[PDB]
Symmetry: D2
Subunit: 350 residues, 4 copies
């Protein structure tokens, strides 16, 4: 049990400062890091061709929204392509993001792959050459990263293997990021697919998060220089029992309180399949939950920040301003929610 | 994995209420749970015979001190024998304690045993018939329990085996306690023995508590109905490098923040080989640390509540008052300490 | 990872020597180690009262059967009470067993306890004071021990927790036994309860045994000085599908080949509710299975050695010889079975 | 837990048949899978330039030695480049290997990388797109693969982290291979660097192998369709105490017996820094060791099959035959060793 410090005091300070800036009071993260394949699905749903120019234009649309988003957006997550694209005025997109007060983030995973011998479970690849990629990304303006693991609640899932293997790969990814001055966002996503109830989600979330933080400990991860991107605890999409937002909040915050060490700087929730308003209301309820919550509780939203903007845009340039207006409004809503100031205007049961 | 609830909401509420009572603001725990062989050592240091009557009398002395300890003392841990002894007025000791505002605790472990294949490391025994014992203890007035694992920082210790095994047995004990409405105090003590510096203790303490909480999770422990009893993070006893109390506090609070889930109701530090004054100054510094601390940080002191009481007693019936006075002074000192009201680059941690 | 040898070369030689004697070619184990409440059930099944004297007599009946059993029986497992009883002629039962060429064994667990938050799963207790017990048992003539863990195949079982905790307590027991010159028989019994098929049993058996052997390594267990007592791999009791003895044998030996290091001296199957004949026929098929089998494959039978003897006895002293005759025939049959001499597409596994 | 078979009976049969073929009696493996950067250091030691043609030529030299090697060589491991190279007669190197009765193997790892927070310890990278790479390698003639993890004996190493992480990634790699009809050789190398003694190496080897097989079990690996490639148990290179070959063999076979399940089809030892003769004598002692050994015990040698052949070649075209003769000699020596029938540059330490 001997210490061979992974990081010097100077490196730790850098990572903690980055993580805190990202989730500073009022702020959250725009997840605009959809891969070519995944954003294709997005463009297809508004009858728009999947071209590099259309992708650049749409990302530009979000990133150059007016300065009302500035106090709302602490970080933006980009896909590799977008990190090296430019606004119309010649400015690299990372420069655009920084000029508006946002930290630049990069998605570094290479997608999920099947775990043999399991019931449709996966782990995530992307470790190969990751240190070199992170050194390069750091040099080109990124200060944090994202890696997404995916788990499913079902009859025999998540299995012990899936839990252990996904926690392990997350820790390796985190270790490599921190060696290169990159703050890792750890995403152990538990899908909402299925008809399980709220407490089954809460139980699995608690088990998954316990495994994640044990792996991070084993791999010597500096928690203060990390963020967590979990699912909210919710019933399954097909569950018949209804729950209030207060119950979703309580279950979510209880699960986190039981597993997430206080040294973690912030929890940036994924929105999953939730509508824009639903995601905002839940995040707001979570921040109003009367329990002690010793980490920032904010958003890292893809769909829940973009759904309307993508719609209003319809792939037509003249709609640019109305689409940006849709984004800014969700940005404002979620900035309020991550402070518990959003208005549409028995713990032991957990 | 599928849920098969260990506890009902009503069982959870009971355990949570107990844990919060013990560590309510300004309160800590008196650890008077020395076994026969251990208390023998105490009495020996004051030239006093180790008879049941002297044990009964010494405990009486501590437990019936005046009402100025009432707000200082949320809990009192007893050894089996004492739980069934009575004060001079005929009242069972559990009743004395309860009448003064205290929750009754019972140590239930049966001591350390060697782990073979290790360099002098141990685990702790005491699981056998534990459930039946707990049911009886509960019936006879106890609401919490204590179990002590011991780890040591050395050349090749604590080993992975020692960490894994002590964490696992602590989880088994916590689980059984909770099934019987007893709040388990989880004590994974890392000894201060040796010449290691402060950061090595911080490193080992962080690794140990990560293991403890993973094990508590695997065993479905309800954290809200548990307390943690760790060593403070300090340099080894023979460490040549010196540190301030503020550094001790920072290393300690940082270790806990990196491992102890917010759901844990309280952390009740053991005093180790710290003097009465040192133990209070450090607990005060810890509570003054500038970080967020989402659990009570208070005391479960044995020696550091008793050193001066014992010496002033000296084994003489007629020194009762002066001895009870020394105990009350340490109780008052530590009550202020766990509130940060006692006067006698964190990225580097 | 540094070695701090658990055992000297001399301690190893002793343990290995004992292990090999117990499972010498043709030899198996009589499990007569039913606890008071377990033998009670057995006695009620023949309307016989559970008194110490009837237990003594029944155990005497088995232990003093004629010398035809000597080449058959390498070891006899006893419950504590029986280790300290005497035959009619005054000879301690251990002396009896040993004059007939057998090694004396002692069951040292204290039964299963419930694991909270599981679907009816258990672990096993009995570690407290185990070292002191083993040294006394060794002094009083025992050279090996037995410890039973119990796992169940069901919807959510055996869980990760059940598998990890039972592997772990098995390793602790093994470590303590070996410190005291006692060969531990490691028994992780997977019950045949339920309607699961043969491949499900095989799968759960492989997962359980992998966990067991990893735990034994973590705790520095000297495998040459151990024996394994697993279930055979068979369909569940309620399973509607039919299998031949050859498929049971193939599944069992395949399971063992994938998990049990060659260093293990022997595998002594529990009978697990199989009839006497079925248990013998399966062991026989296991020993004829054409795959490489680098450990002795033999028996540690309770019911499959006793059922007919207990029936022929029916609690009447005068049925002594008819009773013993039934036991001797099962001893003979099983000694032949563990030699593959008893007569009353591996990639599919 | 519930079963969702990773493999069908048909797939198991194929993987089992491949594994048994590689380590059939008398047969071992030639490890010719040095990456560009490693073969370069090989060529440097003989003033030969590191060019594609020199590498191609040297590999041809080994693969086309006369037919005396056919019964000695059950498998040949190649680096990616070599897999798609051809001999002078236009035949792809895999065709050459098969025509001489050998199975074709492909190294698929992408080298070691540092584990942060450790004392100089590594894990191994190479899982990204491994499935796709394996499917392609299968199509192009390869039936097994090799992946190398590296561990080091020292004061604080191997650490719990290094052991777990390396065993886990080995399991991931084994799993992906088997999904694509490729037999994975699992190589958990414990370096002989340092001055530790025999029993320390034996202890570390037992611990590392227990972890590797637990990982493989957790990841549902089919052991009959794997091979293991461990270090032999030996004292450290700087250890002053001396041991006989019988002792090395005993410690090696004991360590294996305590950790490697009988289902594993074979154990193909790495030579490490052992001389060509040292590697053959030890391998021979191991097979003569009077304990029960339920797996084939053979070789997967790089340096210990190639040292003399490299030196005799010297990069000169005209030394073709002289080189091949040195290789054939080591191959025959080792085919006998892995049967326990072997009796004695081939003496120079290759550390
Ligand atoms: C679409 O974004 C990611 C999934 O697709 P790719 O990995 O192929 O790009 C995914 O990481 C996403 O960014 C996160 O899950 C957060 O998004 P939501 O807030 O919509 O759940
Ligand atoms: C004080 O009681 C204990 C002494 O050992 P025994 O278990 O034989 O009675 C011990 O548990 C003590 O409570 C501490 O854990 C160690 O010393 P401190 O209480 O001063 O910290
Ligand atoms: C002899 O029977 C034993 C009874 O166990 P308990 O006293 O703890 O209830 C039994 O454990 C036996 O030792 C083995 O399990 C094998 O017995 P069977 O061959 O009948 O399955
Ligand atoms: C140890 O690895 C294999 C056996 O080598 P030795 O028998 O000489 O010890 C071998 O295949 C080795 O991995 C390659 O020669 C070199 O691999 P890299 O290309 O990763 O450096």
């Amino acid at each position: 049990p001997h210490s061979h410090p992974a990081l010097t005091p100077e490196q730790k300070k850098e990572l903690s400062d980055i993580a805190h800036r990202i989730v500073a009071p009022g702020k959250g993260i725009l997840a605009a890091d959809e891969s070519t394949g995944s954003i294709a699905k997005r463009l297809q749903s508004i009858g728009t061709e999947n071209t590099e120019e259309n992708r650049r234009f749409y990302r530009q649309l979000l990133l150059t929204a007016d300065d009302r988003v500035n106090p709302c957006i602490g970080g933006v997550i980009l896909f590799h392509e977008t990190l090296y694209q430019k606004a119309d005025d010649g400015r690299p997109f990372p420069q655009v993001i920084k000029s508006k007060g946002g930290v630049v983030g990069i998605k570094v995973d290479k997608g999920v792959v099947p775990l043999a011998g399991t019931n449709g479970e996966t782990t995530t690849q992307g470790l190969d050459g990751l240190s070199e990629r992170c050194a390069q990304y750091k040099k080109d303006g990124a200060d944090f990263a994202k890696w997404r693991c995916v788990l499913k609640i079902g009859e025999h899932t998540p299995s012990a293997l899936a839990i252990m293997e996904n926690a392990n790969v997350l820790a390796r990814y985190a270790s490599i990021c921190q060696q290169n001055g990159i703050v890792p966002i750890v995403e152990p996503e538990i899908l909402p697919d299925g008809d399980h109830d709220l407490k089954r989600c809460q139980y699995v979330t608690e088990k998954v998060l316990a495994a994640v933080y044990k792996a991070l400990s084993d791999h010597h991860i500096y928690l203060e220089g990390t963020l967590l991107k979990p699912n909210m605890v919710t019933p399954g999409h097909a569950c018949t029992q209804k729950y209030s937002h207060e119950e979703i909040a309580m279950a979510t915050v209880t699960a986190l309180r039981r597993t997430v060490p206080p040294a973690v700087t912030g929890v940036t929730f994924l929105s999953g399949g939730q509508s824009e308003e639903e995601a905002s209301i839940n995040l707001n309820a979570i921040n109003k939950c009367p329990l002690l919550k010793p980490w920032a509780l904010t958003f890292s939203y893809g769909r829940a920040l973009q759904a309307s903007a993508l719609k209003a845009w319809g792939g037509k340039k003249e709609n640019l301003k109305a689409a940006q207006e849709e984004y800014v409004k969700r940005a404002l809503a979620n900035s309020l929610a991550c402070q518990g100031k959003y208005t549409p205007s028995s713990n032991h049961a957990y």
